[PDB]
């Protein structure tokens, strides 16, 4: 298959100039359609055929390339342009898409309001020990959540939900919820959520215990 590795993965600017480079594995000389999907919405073609402006898309965008490694550029940024931008080839079946670029706003590196939560005891009466690890108001996207159940590094038993880019400060908020049961809720004690973020200087390990 001909694969699209779209660069970068995320992007941060503020009326800035944005440039996105999407390459190929083969010679696709001009056969790429440049897309826009805002989160929770439909896609939107921006530059069809890797160089030509779609009618209805404003003139601040500009894509081009070489034959293999194509490049979209934006002059200039608008505050509604913080979306996911996907390159996609039109040279060969099957259709392969790009990596996308979830673009937030370059701003102050904000530390998360890190919190951990015991499940309620009627939720213990439901049996589910949903250990909730709250984060709030962090910038950038670079956050890591590490779990501990009696210092066993838990993985797969957690469901994580993150807010989008904020309006009032363009930060994120996170909730990684360690989905567990009651038999290992009471069969274990040390319930720690280790949180690493760039605004954090250290991996913050909030913790609690069985019922505590």
């Amino acid at each position: 298959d001909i694969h699209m590795t779209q660069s970068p993965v995320s992007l941060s600017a503020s009326g800035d100039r944005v440039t996105i480079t999407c390459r190929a594995s083969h010679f696709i000389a001009n056969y790429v359609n440049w897309y826009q999907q805002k989160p929770g919405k439909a896609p939107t073609l921006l530059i069809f055929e890797s160089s030509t402006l779609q009618r209805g898309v404003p003139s601040r965008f500009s894509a081009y390339g070489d034959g293999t490694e194509f490049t979209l550029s934006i002059n200039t940024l608008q505050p509604e342009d913080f979306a996911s931008y996907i390159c996609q080839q039109s040279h060969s079946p099957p259709v392969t898409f790009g990596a996308g670029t979830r673009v937030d706003q370059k701003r102050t590196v904000a530390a998360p309001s890190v919190f951990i939560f015991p499940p309620s005891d009627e939720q213990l009466k439901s049996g589910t020990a949903s250990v909730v690890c709250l984060l709030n108001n962090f910038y950038p996207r670079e956050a890591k959540v590490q779990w501990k159940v009696d210092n066993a590094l838990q993985s797969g038993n957690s469901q994580e939900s993150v807010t989008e880019q904020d309006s009032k400060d363009s930060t994120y908020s996170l909730s990684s919820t360690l989905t567990l049961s009651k038999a290992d809720y009471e069969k274990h004690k040390v319930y720690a959520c280790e949180v690493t973020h760039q605004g954090l200087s250290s991996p913050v390990t909030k913790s609690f215990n069985r019922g505590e």
Partner: peptide
């Protein structure tokens, strides 16, 4: 900060909604 609902292996929505 009402977080988006995450599904499960059952396929049931588990929504998080917090407030500071």
């Amino acid at each position: 900060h009402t977080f988006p609902a995450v599904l499960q292996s059952s396929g049931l929505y588990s929504l998080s909604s917090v407030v500071t």
